[PDB]
Each structure stands twice: as structure tokens, then as C-alpha cells.
């Protein structure tokens, strides 16, 4: 264990006097405990990779042996804390040292072990009963919003011999003593799980429920299914908080996890301020999203492997919580930075630049990363179910969709949400292009719509084809001079203007537009498309023989109805009863056909 | 028959990437298979790649992880990899390495065959000329695929190539009209499991799961076993063809992942690179994958391959499409522009080509006017595209009557001929009649690709 430390070709250093060890095994170096792991091995000596300035490291210095590869530790107390790429509790570090710099080689467990928690056993398991992995044996009230169920890890089974009673147990306490065949084992409420793999699941089921989104746009037009995969572009100033905040507050998801590399502290202070401000009043009271979310971020000062592995760590945490029987949403920010980190790692290891400097296996790694999603159901007694969704941000170089990473991300993902800076300076919130953004999840949710509302799909198709018709006729109406066009073209243009100014807008800060429910969305859609339908139907009826109706007559006759259509958003569903809103729709429609009949 | 007790050595002199070196190995057996016992007890597997002196480098199928130079063990088989084959495997599902997935048993293996296979005697080959009934007008009539041939389909991300595979494996038939049926073989290549589920469901839609030899492999699985899986599937096809007198519709998917895995292995082995950094022997490897096909003397069976592949960046000069084009005869090249035009089946007819028209068609099989109809249609479509390009700038005013006729012909060609639908099987005769109706718009004089006799015989209708 007396590391025969050599120099460096950078940070990388090799050494000798190493007993039996395996590649990718964590190792501390020197009396300062600089972190690393094995890269290569040979004979008795092995090369290793350190992740810190190697200055001050002398020859022959000790190396601490470990017994695990790159791994994360998980248990009660993880929710609401802040970490980094190698799972280090920087909050606890500032609490322990009160300094403004990173102490090199922190020997601090991510979970403070001096904290007590209130544990209640299952009450169903008995002494001498046989249990396997994935099976809940107790619970702990980590926070008033989410119940942290505790279950056995995988690859472990045996007959229980002792059950700790309910009480007040710290992190180091033992609760289970399981006698496997001929051997015994110890079990606390913290567990260690390596990172470069997926915990096995019993089965994968198809996605059969929409992902709720507060914004009515992106939901009734280009939906994302719960448990799906999405790609959002990322540009300086185009607007990314507009979706992140809305997803964190207004969402049917159960837990939020935000990761990233090469970011600022500004978003961190923003979410700090959003702890009270963006609170959800499920019980009419202010509870912090901190209880419902966990943060992890890294600056570009952090080691390259920390940036590389934080993205895997996000999936590991999401897996741990989807095992509990919950629904997770992932904010995999700054994927291009991850690609650059991988390129730097390959440059360190002297691989060949397969394409544009990026390594050969980038696409394969991305595919493996996006494999971890969907709705599943895991090993256990109650047969719970959960899901995991991913939202990876992509930063193309100036919008060019040609560098390999964006092409791969477009290829693997199904639904793309478009953003624009033209619309951004057009004071349009949120910005969506409507022509490059697409979806592929309509087929899965067909039965859901057919069962619940039964009019969503036809109205949605009418909406999108009307928008496409506007896009097509824009060039013709520009060419002619915007003074000669058939009446049906006029009504299509006008309803495009109305669906623009009315249905495709929203102000978050406005109290009544903070949340738009799905039923409100489909009600607006049905009302507007039915109005357009009766409009061009009557126009086609009267255009040929006599009493040729023009839009001026329609406007002067239905001006009150146009004003009502413009102003019908002012509803405030929180206060106004929903049944009253549906009755309002009914009487508005009543006025619609009355006016259309009286026109003829 | 091998009455030699097995061996096992613990002398692991190193590990570098996916490679492992074994010193003091006694009399290495090249191209061997070994099994590895990790310290915690998990089993692993690999094949010996290189031997020199008392050293033996060995690559691991599932990937290096956790191997300890002092604790792990390795045991030696002394025989090249031989896979279990069986005729009862039809209707089953396995992973890439061949183990059961459906809680099925270890297959009772009618024989043990070489994974690398063997070549075929040249003189023991017979040319195939039987036309297959696909039910797609763009295939039957333009790029008709015959038995004993290996046409792939060049597709990109988001294209409906999976549905094309479904249709071709569903509406298979014989143009020349006892019963017939095709023993489907399919192996995934790390594709996302949604497409695997869709293929499974469509295969029950066929209603003949009893003739579906299926293999699977997902993205999250180790990358390097993708080098093995297609060879195992091809060995199964060989066994079912030349030992059981059956026809097999072998189909693959996503050869780009195979190319990537081979690239990673080559990079680990630091061989001499080539174009875009690909391995030099990728061509010979692809040859060993594809040329295992056809039908031979003394056997009524045959091998048909449809190895669809991903086409990155829609670039025809990308090495993988190029080399796949060289090694094979034909291509399809599903189009992105047509799919963005919202037309199905979106197969571009021009870049596609089939080399088996030389004997698959002609008098006595389909008709005495198939080839000249197809040649005339190709010429008319190409010139229609050219005049469309001219019209893109010149404007309709300066054109002539011929230009408008060509544009109208192109419009008819796209709206009617290509538009075929998802479940409307069509006969050869109907496609020929449709093509003749399309061609009828042009008077006889400007038809420069039809002989006089056929033109006088068939046109005036």
C-alpha cells in the first residue's frame, strides 16, 4: 500500500506496491487523500487517474484501498440537499469548515450520520419469514409530503431473525439481521449502489398517461407522455426558466431532480427564492419545493470526471426513487457540456478522434443513457408502479443542427419542443416555433382520450391543419398584395390571428393565468374550432347563389361574440367553480348558434 | 469425443481496456473460448484473440469490469466457439448471447456448428430467378426482389423503415401463380426496446409465431456482444436451410451499431484506420456477414437477407452505406423528403436499383413487356425531375407543352403509383396495368425507350 508514486503526464499518475484490485476502483492518495481510481493494471503495479492538483505529493506515499467501484450512497435525508458530481455535501462542508474554498479530499459522508429519524416497521413481516430484494420492510417520515419507503436492496434475501421496533434511530443503526444460506448479514437504512448499470426491474409497461403541464400550449398541441423522453434547445436569453419553473411547480410528477455541469449559482439562488414563492398549496399552505426536489450542480472548476458522472448520478437517484413507487422528472441540463467532458476524457486517454474530435462511442453512450426511462414495475410484495421521464437540454452552435451530438439527440428523442428568439423579442411567452417542433406519442394516448373526453383528437387535428393552412397561405397572400383572396382564406387567416393572440399566449405572473388546466384547454379549442366551422360553413352556403356574406357583415353582426371570444380567458379557475365554467361554455355556444341562425 | 480434462490458470499479467493478458499459459489454443469466475462469483465469457509465446490476449464479450489480477480465475475450452442450433427454436426468444428470455430452457441443440461458419464452394451455386411477391408497387415492378438475394434498405432516424420491414415480412408470396411460408429470422442490434415490442406485436399479427426465430439486444446491454449476435443468427439460418429443406427470410436491423462496436474494438486494438477512422477489415467482416446466402445444388431451400441499416446525416458517401452498396447488389433508400411530404410508402424510386432483372423477369415468368415499361418509367421520372428543377427558376410561362406534360406525369406518378397504403396487397398484373395507364398520357411518338412492336401491340387502349 506504499504507492510508488511517479510523476505525471498531467494529473494522471501511476504507482506500485498494490495488492489485488480491480479496474475503476476508488483510491485515495497521499496524506491529503486525493481521490482517484484505477485505469490500467499490470503485474503488481497499476496506473491511476487523480482528479486534483497533484502538487505536494511525494514518492512512496500511502494509498487507501477501497472495496467498491464508483458508487453513490442513498438513504433518508438525501431529499432537499445539495451535492456535486462525486456526491459531496457542499452544504455540510460549508457547515463544517466555514471557509470559502473547497478543502482538498473531503472525507465527509453525504448523509450526516448524527441525525435521528422516526422509523415504523412494516407490521406485516414476522420473525422467521423469508423475504427477497426490493421488498419494503418499513417506512420513515422524511417529510410531510413524501413518505420514504425503505426496502431491501437487490441480490439479497434470507430469513429475518430480528426486527427493530418503531422508535428513534440514527443513520448508523441496524434494523434487520437476515440469515441467508449458512451466513448472516447486517443491514442499516443506507445502501451503496454502483453507477454504471441499471438496477433490474420486473417488467416494463407501455406509457398510458399524459404528462401534465401547466402551460396549455405544448400539452393540447404537442403533448409529452409521462415517462417519455424530450429535447429542448438551449440559448442565452431565449428562455429556459419558463419551462423549468412551470414543471417544478405545476406538474403531476411526484419528485423533481435537477442536474447539470458548467452552470452558475444564479439558478441556485433562484430556486432558493422559489422555495417559498413557487410553493404549491396542495393543502392551502406554503410548503417548500425543497421538500419535493433535490439539487445537484457543478461548475467548470470541478474535475472532468465529476461533470461526466453527475449525469449518470441523476439517473441513479431517479432510479432509487422510482423503485419506491413514485414518478420522477429529470432535468438533464447542458448535455453538450457532457459531450465536451467526454471528449476531454478521451483526449486524456489518447483515443482516436472518430468524428469532429468527439470519440467513437458518444452515440452509443447517449442511447444507453436514454434507455433508462418509461413506465415500469419493480420487485416487491405490493406490486407498486412508477415512471421516469427525461428532459435533456441541447446547445447547438448557433442553431446549426449538424454537429454530431445534436443529430444523435434528435435521432433518439421522440418529441421536440422548439424555442425561438424572434418570438422572444416579440414579447411572446412561451416561445414555440410550431413547424419544427413535433411529437410521436399520439398513438399511445389514443385510448385515454377516447375514454375520458372523446373529442380531443379531431379538434387537435383541425387546429394543427388550420395552422399549417395559415403557414401555406402566408406566402400567397404576401405575393398577391394582401387584398385579394377567397372568403374561406379570410376566415382561416382571422381564426389564425385569434388563436395566436388568445389561445397560444399565457402570462405566468398574471394570477388567473398561472395554471391553465387541460379541460380549460380543450374547451377553448372546441369552442373556437366550432365557431370557425359554422363560420366557413355559412360562408360556403351563401357564397354561390345570393346574399353573399363577407367578413365585414360577419364582424358587425358578431362583434359582441368576437369580444366574448377575446375576453373568455378571464376565468380564474381557482375561485370560479368548474361546473360554472362549463355552463358558461354551454351558454356561449348557445349564443353562437343563435347568432348564426339569425344571420340567415 | 475430447477426453482431455479442462485447465484453469490464475496468472493474469494485466488488463488494458477490454483486453486481458494471461502469462504462463501453456500451449495456447488460438480462436478459443474461455470462461471467467469473478471474485464475487458472477460468470463472464470471452474469446482468445492473440497468442505469442507463453502469453495469450483475450477479449471479453460482456466487457471488462471488476476483474482482479490476483483473485479471478480463467478456464480453457480448447475448441473454437460452437453455438447450439435447433429446429425447435422457432417461436422462442433469446438475448444476444443466446440464453433464454421467456423462462425457456437451455435449447436441446441438434448440433454444434462453427460460429464463423465456412465458405461455399463456387461451383456448388445455382442462380436464383424466382420473383417474390412483396405487395408493394415500388418493389414489384421497379426493384423486384428475387429469392436468394440480399437487398438492404437505407434508412435514417425517424423514417418508417420498421413498417416497411413489417409489410415485406407480412405480404411475402410468390409471383409465379402446394402452400408456402417463410421461416422468419430476426435479431435486434441494440435498438431501443419500443421497436422490439412493435416487431413482436406485428409478428403475432402475422399469426405464425411458430415460424419466428427471434433474438434480442438492447442499448443498455454490453456493446461488444453485438459482434457475435448476427453470426449466431446466420448459423441458425444455415442450419434451417441446408439441413431441414426450408426457406428462411433472414432480416437484420441497425448495422450502424454493429459498425460502431467493431470500430470500438479496433480502436482498442489500435489497428491501421481507414476512411472516417473505420477499421480496414470492416469490409471483410461485412463480407462474412452478407455473402452467407443464396441456394445451392441438391437443395430446394434458399436464403434471403434484408439487412436494413441506419444512415447517419443522410450522406450517401458515408462509408457504411458505400461499403454495404459494394458488397450487395441492390438498395431501396427510403426518403426523408417523401416522408416530410406525408406520403406512404415513401420509397424514392430513382436511387433504388435491383440487379436481378436480368433473369427474374422476362417472357415465361411475368410478361414480354415488363422491362421496357420499367425503363420507360424510369426515364420519364428522371426527365420529369429535371424539368421540375428547371421550372423551379424559369417559370411556367417560358416552358413548352412537353414540360407541362412531364410535370403532369410526375404528379400522377407520385399521387397514384407510389401511394399504396398499409394493408392493400396488390398483384403484379395490377401494377403493370397502373403503369400502362400512367404512361398513356404521353402519345406514342415521344416514347424513346419502348420497341416498335410492343408499342403498337399494347398502347392503343
Amino acid at each position: 500500500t506504499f504507492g510508488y508514486v511517479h510523476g505525471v503526464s498531467g494529473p494522471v499518475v501511476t504507482a506500485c506496491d498494490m495488492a489485488g484490485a480491480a479496474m475503476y476502483e476508488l483510491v485515495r492518495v497521499g496524506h491529503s487523500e486525493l481521490v482517484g481510481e484505477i485505469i490500467r493494471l499490470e503485474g503488481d503495479m497499476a496506473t491511476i487517474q487523480v482528479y486534483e492538483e497533484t502538487s505536494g505529493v511525494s514518492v512512496g506515499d500511502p494509498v487507501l484501498r477501497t472495496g467498491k467501484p464508483l458508487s453513490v450512497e442513498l438513504g433518508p435525508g438525501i431529499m432537499g440537499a445539495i451535492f456535486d458530481g462525486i456526491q459531496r455535501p457542499l452544504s455540510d462542508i460549508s457547515s463544517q469548515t466555514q471557509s470559502i474554498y473547497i478543502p482538498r479530499g473531503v472525507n465527509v459522508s453525504a448523509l450526516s450520520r448524527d441525525i435521528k429519524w422516526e422509523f415504523i416497521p412494516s407490521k406485516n413481516l414476522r420473525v422467521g419469514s423469508h423475504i427477497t430484494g426490493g421488498d419494503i420492510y418499513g417506512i420513515v417520515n422524511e417529510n410531510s409530503l413524501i413518505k420514504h419507503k425503505i426496502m431491501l436492496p437487490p441480490r439479497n434475501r434470507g430469513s429475518v431473525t430480528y426486527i427493530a421496533p418503531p422508535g428513534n434511530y440514527d443513520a448508523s443503526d441496524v434494523v434487520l439481521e437476515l440469515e441467508f444460506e449458512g451466513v448472516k448479514e447486517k443491514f442499516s437504512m443506507v445502501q451503496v449502489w454502483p453507477v454504471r448499470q441499471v438496477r433490474p426491474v420486473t417488467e416494463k409497461l407501455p406509457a398510458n398517461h399524459p404528462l401534465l403541464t401547466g402551460q396549455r400550449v405544448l400539452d393540447a398541441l404537442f403533448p409529452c407522455v409521462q415517462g417519455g423522453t424530450t429535447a429542448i434547445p438551449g440559448a442565452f436569453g431565449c428562455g429556459k426558466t419558463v419551462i423549468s419553473q412551470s414543471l417544478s411547480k405545476y406538474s403531476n410528477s411526484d419528485v423533481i431532480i435537477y442536474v447539470g455541469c458548467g452552470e452558475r449559482g444564479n439558478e441556485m439562488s433562484e430556486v432558493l427564492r422559489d422555495f417559498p414563492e413557487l410553493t404549491m398549496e396542495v393543502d392551502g399552505k406554503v410548503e417548500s419545493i425543497m421538500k419535493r426536489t433535490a439539487l445537484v450542480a457543478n461548475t467548470s472548476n470541478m474535475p472532468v470526471a465529476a461533470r461526466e458522472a453527475s449525469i449518470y448520478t441523476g439517473i441513479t437517484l431517479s432510479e432509487y426513487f422510482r423503485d419506491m413507487g413514485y414518478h420522477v422528472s429529470m432535468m438533464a441540463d447542458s448535455t453538450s457540456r457532457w459531450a465536451e467532458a467526454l471528449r476531454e476524457i478521451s483526449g486524456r486517454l489518447a483515443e482516436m478522434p472518430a468524428d469532429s474530435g468527439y470519440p467513437a462511442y458518444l452515440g452509443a453512450r447517449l442511447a444507453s443513457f436514454y434507455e433508462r426511462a418509461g413506465r415500469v414495475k419493480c420487485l416487491g410484495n405490493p406490486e407498486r408502479e412508477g415512471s421516469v421521464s427525461i428532459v435533456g437540454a441541447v446547445s447547438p452552435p448557433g442553431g446549426d443542427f449538424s454537429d454530431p451530438v445534436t443529430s444523435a439527440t434528435l435521432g433518439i428523442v421522440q418529441v421536440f419542443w422548439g424555442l425561438d428568439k424572434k418570438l422572444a423579442q416579440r414579447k411572446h411567452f412561451p416561445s414555440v416555433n410550431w413547424l419544427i417542433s413535433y411529437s410521436k406519442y399520439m398513438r399511445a394516448l389514443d385510448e385515454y382520450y377516447d375514454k375520458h373526453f372523446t373529442e380531443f383528437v379531431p379538434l387537435r387535428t383541425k387546429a394543427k391543419e388550420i395552422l399549417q393552412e395559415e403557414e401555406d397561405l402566408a406566402e400567397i397572400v404576401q405575393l398577391v398584395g394582401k387584398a385579394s383572396l377567397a372568403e374561406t382564406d379570410k376566415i382561416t387567416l382571422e381564426v389564425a390571428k385569434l388563436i395566436k393572440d388568445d389561445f397560444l399566449q399565457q402570462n405566468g405572473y398574471t394570477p388567473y393565468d398561472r395554471f391553465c388546466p387541460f379541460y380549460k384547454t380543450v374547451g377553448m379549442l372546441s369552442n373556437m374550432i366550432s365557431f370557425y366551422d359554422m363560420a366557413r360553413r355559412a360562408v360556403e352556403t351563401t357564397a354561390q347563389s345570393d346574399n353573399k356574406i363577407t367578413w365585414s357583415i360577419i364582424r358587425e353582426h358578431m362583434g359582441e361574440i368576437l369580444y366574448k371570444l377575446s375576453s373568455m380567458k378571464f376565468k380564474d379557475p381557482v375561485k370560479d367553480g368548474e361546473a360554472k365554467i362549463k355552463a358558461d361554455y354551454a351558454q356561449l355556444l348557445e349564443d353562437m348558434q343563435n347568432a348564426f341562425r339569425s344571420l340567415e | 469425443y475430447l477426453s482431455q480434462p479442462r485447465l484453469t490458470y490464475k496468472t493474469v499479467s494485466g488488463v488494458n481496456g477490454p483486453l486481458v493478458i494471461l502469462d504462463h499459459v501453456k500451449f495456447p489454443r488460438y480462436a478459443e473460448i474461455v470462461h471467467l469466475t469473478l471474485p464475487d462469483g458472477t460468470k463472464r465469457s470471452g474469446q482468445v484473440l492473440e497468442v505469442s509465446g507463453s502469453k495469450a490476449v483475450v477479449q471479453v464479450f460482456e466487457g471488462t469490469s471488476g476483474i482482479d489480477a490476483k483473485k479471478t480465475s480463467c478456464e480453457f475450452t480448447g475448441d473454437i466457439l460452437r453455438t447450439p442450433v435447433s429446429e425447435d427454436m422457432l417461436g422462442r426468444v433469446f438475448n444476444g448471447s443466446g440464453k433464454p428470455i421467456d423462462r425457456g430452457p437451455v435449447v436441446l441443440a441438434e448440433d454444434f456448428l462453427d460460429i464463423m461458419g465456412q465458405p461455399i464452394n463456387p461451383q456448388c451455386r445455382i442462380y436464383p430467378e424466382e420473383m417474390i411477391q412483396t405487395g408493394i408497387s415500388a418493389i414489384d415492378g421497379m426493384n423486384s426482389i428475387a429469392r436468394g438475394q440480399k437487398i438492404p434498405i437505407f434508412s435514417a432516424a425517424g423514417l418508417p423503415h420498421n413498417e416497411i420491414a413489417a409489410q415485406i415480412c407480412r405480404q411475402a408470396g410468390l409471383v409465379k401463380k402446394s402452400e408456402e411460408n417463410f421461416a422468419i429470422v430476426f435479431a435486434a442490434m441494440g435498438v431501443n426496446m419500443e421497436t422490439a415490442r412493435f416487431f413482436k406485436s406485428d409478428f403475432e399479427e402475422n399469426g405464425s409465431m411458430d415460424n419466428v426465430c427471434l433474438f434480442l439486444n438492447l442499448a443498455n446491454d454490453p456493446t461488444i456482444e453485438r459482434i457475435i449476435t448476427p453470426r449466431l443468427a446466420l448459423t441458425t439460418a444455415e442450419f434451417l436451410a441446408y439441413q431441414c429443406e426450408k426457406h428462411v427470410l433472414v432480416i437484420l436491423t441497425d448495422m450502424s451499431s454493429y459498425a460502431e462496436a467493431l470500430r470500438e474494438v479496433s480502436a482498442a486494438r489500435e489497428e491501421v484506420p481507414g476512411r472516417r477512422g473505420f477499421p480496414g477489415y470492416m469490409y471483410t467482416d461485412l463480407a462474412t456477414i452478407y455473402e452467407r446466402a443464396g441456394r445451392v445444388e441438391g437443395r430446394n431451400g434458399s436464403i434471403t437477407q434484408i439487412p436494413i441499416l441506419t444512415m447517419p446525416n443522410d450522406d450517401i458517401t458515408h462509408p457504411i452505406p458505400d461499403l454495404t452498396g459494394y458488397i450487395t447488389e441492390g438498395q431501396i433508400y427510403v426518403d426523408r423528403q417523401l416522408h416530410n411530404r406525408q406520403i406512404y410508402p415513401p420509397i424514392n424510386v430513382l436511387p433504388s436499383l435491383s440487379r436481378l432483372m436480368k433473369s427474374a423477369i422476362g417472357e415465361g415468368m411475368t410478361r414480354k413487356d415488363h422491362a421496357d415499361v420499367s425503363n420507360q418509367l424510369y426515364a420519364c421520372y428522371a426527365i420529369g425531375k429535371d424539368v421540375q428543377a428547371m421550372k423551379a427558376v424559369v417559370g411556367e410561362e417560358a416552358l413548352t407543352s412537353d414540360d407541362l406534360l412531364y410535370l403532369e406525369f410526375l404528379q400522377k406518378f407520385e399521387k397514384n403509383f407510389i401511394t399504396q397504403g398499409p394493408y392493400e396487397n396488390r398483384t403484379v398484373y395490377e401494377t403493370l396495368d397502373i403503369g400502362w395507364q400512367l404512361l398513356r398520357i404521353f402519345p406514342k411518338e415521344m416514347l424513346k425507350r419502348i420497341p416498335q412492336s410492343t408499342l403498337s401491340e399494347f398502347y392503343p387502349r
Partner: peptide, 18 residues
């Protein structure tokens, strides 16, 4: 890059002659 890598490895293996 590949050519330079090859010659660098050649120099290295020559260095470890003894």
C-alpha cells in the same frame, strides 16, 4: 494523429529494451 501515435509507441517500446 494516428501516424504520430504509432511512432511514439515505437519509440516507447524501443525505450523499454532494458
Amino acid at each position: 494523429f494516428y501516424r504520430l501515435k504509432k511512432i511514439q509507441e515505437k519509440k516507447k517500446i524501443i525505450k523499454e529494451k532494458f
